[PDB]
Design a protein around this ligand. Structure first.
Ligand SMILES: O=P(O)(O)OC[C@H]1O[C@](O)(COP(=O)(O)O)[C@@H](O)[C@@H]1O
Ligand SMILES: O=P(O)(O)OC[C@H]1O[C@](O)(COP(=O)(O)O)[C@@H](O)[C@@H]1O
Ligand SMILES: [Mg+2]
Ligand SMILES: [Mg+2]
Ligand SMILES: [Mg+2]
Ligand SMILES: [Mg+2]
Lengths: 501, 501, 501, 501
């Protein structure tokens, strides 16, 4: 039984061995990276069902990101399985500054009046919190009285009660006991700081990633189509037009501009972490269901992200609410589920991937009964999509073990995936860029093969590659689609129902 | 635009020329048949949309039926289009006898006192009507005072007021003004006459038709599966197992046994004339809709019959009730609509076929809006039926001008027909008997062609035959299904969507 | 079992006895009307299920119409049941003129060239057919070359090949053998003769009918809302605001303006006779289904008319197509079915009503399975309509024998009727005008009772009136709605489920 | 706007003040309970939306449970709002023992070797954990080498590596860093311990609760209908047949016997903590959705429990997975959501109830869009249920602010709740036991009132009580149901739609 829901696993120090030590043992950052022992840990995540690795450029310099990517290339050869490479941009982050005295945090009590400095390049005091704003912007004129400054996952609340025009400080009232640590995430909901459509830092991170070799870019805090189009222009300019863009929807503007963002992007990452601080937390499930339905209707990819197995950062078993979240993401229609801290920073990265895969594989068997997606309502807007509808109809009419598409660009695999057939989809393609580019599409098993000649029987090929990969055996029924014959067919034009020999 | 609902037309003197005279002209019957002039009249009915001719063996002898079948074979050569040949049996029925001195009929007024004889083997007079009871049964002890004897599909009622033991005659009162003609159907509701299992006359009639060459037998007053199986045994014994059997349901016993009759038969004829006298008339629309649904679910053929354009026997225009009836039969899901007196006996046989074709062609355009049949409900019970579902799905997803099937036995064409796709179905077949056997399946346009060899491109043949038939032109989209390749495929296994070159 | 579909029966000479003779016996028009013997025949139609009588002012002068209406008032007291009184207007009829020589018709052959005179007040010749146009209009400039003049139910076709500007004659080619008799209906499709919105003759007929006492006006050839509003103004002006207007839809303009006509009228009569000559005959069933759905959605009354049991003009049993038409009108959603010639002019007026009632009563039992109307899709646009939806829900949830509404104006009965509950609707009302005005609403049994006082138990009343009328017995469950309490309630506000004692 | 999904909150030390100290402060446990200060804390939970308090008899003795129930009775008087009292039994379970020297817990590191004792009636030490096995069973021979002993809802794993016959001790290896605290649940998957039919301790616990005054019993680890019927027998014997029984489903035997457990019980608690260790964790979402559907179909109460806001035990904000879990439980169709450690043991008990109330209130607004429950599918099995269907239909047809039922036993309110109308349900009842018994039914706001006399207007009382409760104001539309009149009606038989004066 193959996992149809794809897993994005964030890499980090959790899987990295340094001079024979695990993450957190003292002196770990003293030692050098053991590339081979790190690659063996990553290979186990691949074997357990990670389909794509996320390189979070919020954390770690270009040297760290570049070595981690090179480590995954070894892991793929140990696992005998390729994975997608996804770069996630820093974007317009605000962080608390370093503290004076090297005193790494202070604790505060409800009611207690302090100040937030807008002035950049300074250090924090306990009385006056300083912010590291992306691109060193001045945020003073953008934040009115009665907004909230939220530190570390919205855990510590600061109410802006007055502004000191003379020092450009917010006069803030602590709303609840809590810590302000150095370098923690800050959110200020319901404000419109003029961050550029694409900051220089993100331009540089993307160009670096494109040079290493990536398949996907997840763009943090996408507010408009313009934030996607500016990254598109760089991919185009550098000969990386094959790279797919996922817009991260994590604030109100992104939700408000969702339709134009979906049209410009290849896919959406539902970035629930920031989204649930930036909009009312109880609205996130409403927006999750609505985004998955819209992205599927567009024939594009949706990733559900953040806190999916959060408890597994510290414990070997997830909570009942975490298992419920992963299961309900699948039923809602998600193409992919994601791990952040659980695979990057936690004690149980392999078990986190294994647990998510178990949940995902169980949930896919209930899509027939409880699935929210309804392919019956779609307009079939092309002949390939007409063939994708007919494939879904065959897999509803009888027990089909596997759909096989011979796909030059993956267009036929994406359309079949959009219809969510009751079968795995083997996408036989003729280059590695197309192969890796399909790795986050629901149900698609990408596989590299030789371009078939005008004299080759593609139905025989389809069956032999399915049997070689161990996906079918004697007596199984499969559906095969292709453009026949090669050199004359302009598109996928043929469906065959075949019993494996 | 092509007619998908098939037309059965009953042949009779209405279309026949005798010594230059038309049916109805003085001295008509004193002339002999003009075969060529009659064949040109029948060729016009073929051209207007008659798909099959009904030869009712309840009227006229073997020589008359045999010459009429020969006239139709000539009409096919004149029209350049083949039709089906359907034999309709007498069955376990009562008919009025020939009259003394070959008077054809008499007229009667309400209140006249006449007699009906039970003695077999004699002729009627105006005052004493004799019955031809199948099996030459004596029915005198089976009919009580107060029963009603109905002649000509219930057009004339005779009340049994007394019985004469001396002559074994019913003394009857004429209930309403009307005609008693020779060889007219007689119904005596609420009576149990013990008709034999298969009358000797039905045995002779079926063996004579099978010798002449027929494609269908319509079995009158089918009571049980055994009434079908007995005719099947004759078809198999004489080397005519290709012949298809339609059970006529026209009494309560046929309705009580419908399920076992459908399993034994190739189709049902809803014989509403007898049915609406033998069962409460107000139940016939209920039974019509339920029969159409069950036969379609079984992948078999249903023919709706009797009174469909009754007024056009005498007048050039149908009533509003008749147009409604033909329209609602199509919407109910009928494969075929029938003409009886309108084509066999009326003044407007060509206009009747033309009018029926016009109503049928309009009603097929309303099948998506109003159609009663629901193919989404069917179990797909075989790999050919899975392909038929997928074809229907293709015709629902985009504008398909034509479905082409390359079919050895017609099985693939019968299963595509069952699903009622939004397209015409070109059935390319390799023998005339399979070709004519498909002529009453909804939407099917049968065409004879050479059996493809293993080196032939069946998709090229399909398009070429469709373009040669004038069914499609450059730029139309067609669906083609075939068992690929010839000499290896077990069944239809391939669907191709093709733009006509 | 009560008939929920209402019957409109046209009265005429068929039920009228003159000096002890039936219609058609020689000297019948010599004798005087036997009022009492005529009233006894009409009472039998009432008992057999006629709910409303149609007085067709196309045929018979004011004296004939006035005596027939007075005859029905006696019939109601013999039957012990009231009926609606419907006036049907002549409207813009064109008829063939009287012939010179008193020679009542001529027969014609295909190809034969003749002339149609537009000049009014003259007599017809065999060579030159003259027309009696409503209001003596000149139709010459309105009819182009290549229109068709159709005589007697579209039976004889005349193609206009040229116009003689000098004599104002059409030069016409007979298209098919046929008779032109004196005073037959003429149609000229696809022309726009400027007949007034309301002719003086129709103004006079309506004022006469209003003076005798009518409940309904069916307005012939309604083209726009203006043709309904002009009759509305007369009903209002004369103190007859209670009179309900049915627009007859019988031509293309009426179909084109259907939405504005439904908004201005109380109901639609689908006048299929003219409609099927004025538009293509095969489109009439499409328009019938669409009109019934739209009129029901508006909460108004739809009557399906013409040819429903046509054969029963001359024979005691209807055809299978006639039974199918009446059954399918019921399933389509019609409130009422109508008889014209069958009850007015035929040999079997009582049996025609009885047959139609039998068909209607059988069909209502299949509305659950096959009914085209869908009340689930309606907007509930008021609190009374919300109560009508809840009543329908109760009758779907359990077996309810009867809904009882205490209704001052009938508004609650019409809304409950609109939802088509699975029960009869007893409408207890407090005046005869409201009572008769409900007689064509699906399922409504109108019954006159005393206005309940603020101290009366309306639920006890509802049950006693149901038991007195023989509609329920001991152990039956009924739904009762009322405005409680009387004098305080502004509308129907209460639903009760009650077991009969 | 009112919360329709009910909240069960587990009470514990988190809300209790002891000698002026809060839970967590130094010397807390050296103080005695401050009853009034604790009652004010609990009153805040009632005000935030706690509808019922859970007293878990697996923790603390009779005196502690008895005083806590007394503190809640005071909290009700302070809040001016009544709550439900639910007793949660030990059942056939294993718990960790008290520690020697009333240490409350110890911390353990991965790889530590410790022992688990099987001997009953002793205390734990850090190195030797003792079990309290219901029925004082010896489990030494029931647990093989290689089994896993899990403590605290699977937070800490112990691998059985060897068995010591000399002490009847399991030698175990600590699988992961964690705490072993006193009276924590112990699970040993894939083991068959023969627990008795009803432990003596459950008998004493149930009889003590029934003496104190409770409304609900939640029966832990219900295996069969007999586990419910044994508690029912005690409730009936002691004169407490009003008490409602929720079966907790938390093992495979409870799932295998679900149908017979639902028929025996008044409700189900989906006890996901134990369930997700006793059955594959990935099956718990499948069982949750199926249990919710079956219990709703039975017109009974379903409570979703455990880990719903787990992170808010320690942090002021829930994860995205937790908000999703609460949201999806509401959408699945749950009557009620539960807090355990969040309210009993955490730092943010008030904020947990507030957060749950906010998610629940938002999710109820999405029930028409996304709701899994389908009331259209139910058989209406009684005249009260027919009225509940009609109420739901009224709330679907227009904007109803409130449904008021005048209900002696709560039956009408339970059936309206079952149908999930788009409105709040005010249940006016005449005794406190019926009033508190309705506190966990979806949408029901119970309120005590005088039994109407035969001279009272129940529709006036309904509106007045609703306006006095502040649930509606002038101009709102309400539906009221009642058995009219008092002293004659058998059941609810009347629905009124009323505009509030
Ligand atoms: O798919 P099914 O229903 O088992 O039909 C299989 C049978 O159909 C056939 O293909 C006949 O099909 P055609 O006559 O349409 O070519 C046989 O060869 C075969 O045995
Ligand atoms: O309609 P059902 O389901 O038979 O219920 C009838 C029973 O309901 C009751 O009315 C209880 O209803 P209430 O407690 O809601 O008033 C009983 O008097 C009666 O016996
Ligand atoms: Mg983010
Ligand atoms: Mg017959
Ligand atoms: Mg007319
Ligand atoms: Mg438990």
């Amino acid at each position: 039984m193959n996992k149809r829901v794809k897993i994005v696993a964030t890499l980090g120090p959790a899987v990295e061995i340094r001079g024979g030590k695990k993450f957190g043992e003292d002196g770990y950052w003293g030692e050098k990276l053991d590339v081979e022992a790190s690659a063996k840990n990553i290979a186990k995540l691949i074997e357990a069902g990670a389909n794509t690795f996320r390189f979070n450029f919020s954390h770690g310099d270009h040297q760290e990101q570049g070595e981690r990517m090179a480590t995954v290339k070894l892991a793929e050869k140990i696992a005998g399985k390729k994975v997608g490479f996804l770069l996630d941009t820093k974007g317009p982050e605000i962080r608390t500054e370093l503290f004076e005295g090297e005193a790494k945090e202070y604790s505060y009590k409800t009611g207690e009046k302090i100040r937030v400095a807008t002035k950049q390049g300074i250090k924090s005091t306990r009385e006056v919190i300083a912010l590291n704003v992306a691109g060193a912007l001045d945020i003073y004129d953008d934040v009115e009285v009665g907004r909230q400054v939220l530190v570390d996952d919205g855990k510590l609340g600061l109410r802006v009660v007055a502004k000191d025009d003379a020092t450009r400080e917010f006069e803030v009232e602590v709303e609840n006991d809590g810590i302000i640590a150095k370098q923690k995430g800050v959110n200020i909901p319901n404000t419109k700081i003029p961050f550029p459509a694409l900051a220089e830092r993100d331009n540089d991170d993307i160009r670096f990633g494109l040079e290493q070799g990536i398949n996907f870019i997840a763009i943090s805090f996408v507010r408009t189509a313009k934030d996607v189009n500016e990254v598109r222009a760089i991919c185009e300019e550098t000969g990386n037009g094959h790279v797919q863009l996922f817009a991260k929807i994590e604030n109100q503007q992104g939700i408000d501009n969702l339709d134009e963002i979906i049209e410009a992007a290849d896919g959406i990452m539902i970035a629930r972490g920031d989204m649930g601080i930036e909009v009312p937390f109880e609205m996130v499930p409403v927006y999750q269901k609505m985004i998955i339905k819209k992205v599927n209707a567009a024939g594009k990819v949706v990733i559900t992200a953040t806190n999916m197995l959060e408890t597994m950062t510290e414990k070997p078993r997830a909570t009942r609410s975490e298992v419920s979240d992963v299961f309900n993401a699948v039923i809602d229609g998600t193409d992919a589920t994601m791990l952040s801290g659980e695979s990057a920073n936690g004690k149980y990265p392999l078990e986190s991937v294994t647990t998510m895969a178990t949940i995902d594989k169980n949930a896919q068997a209930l899509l027939n009964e409880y699935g929210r997606l309804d392919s019956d309502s779609f307009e079939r807007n092309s002949k390939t999509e007409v063939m994708a509808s007919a494939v879904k109809d065959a897999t509803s009419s009888m027990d089909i073990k596997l759909v096989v598409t011979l796909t030059k660009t993956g267009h036929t695999a994406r359309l079949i995936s959009k219809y969510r057939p009751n079968a795995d989809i083997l996408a036989l393609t003729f280059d590695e860029l197309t192969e890796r580019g399909l790795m986050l599409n629901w149900g698609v098993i990408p596989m590299l093969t030789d371009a078939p000649s005008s004299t080759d029987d593609m139905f025989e090929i389809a069956e032999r590659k399915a049997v070689e990969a161990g996906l079918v055996e004697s007596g199984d029924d499969i559906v095969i689609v292709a453009g026949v014959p090669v050199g004359e067919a302009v598109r996928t034009n043929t469906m065959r129902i075949r019993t494996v020999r």
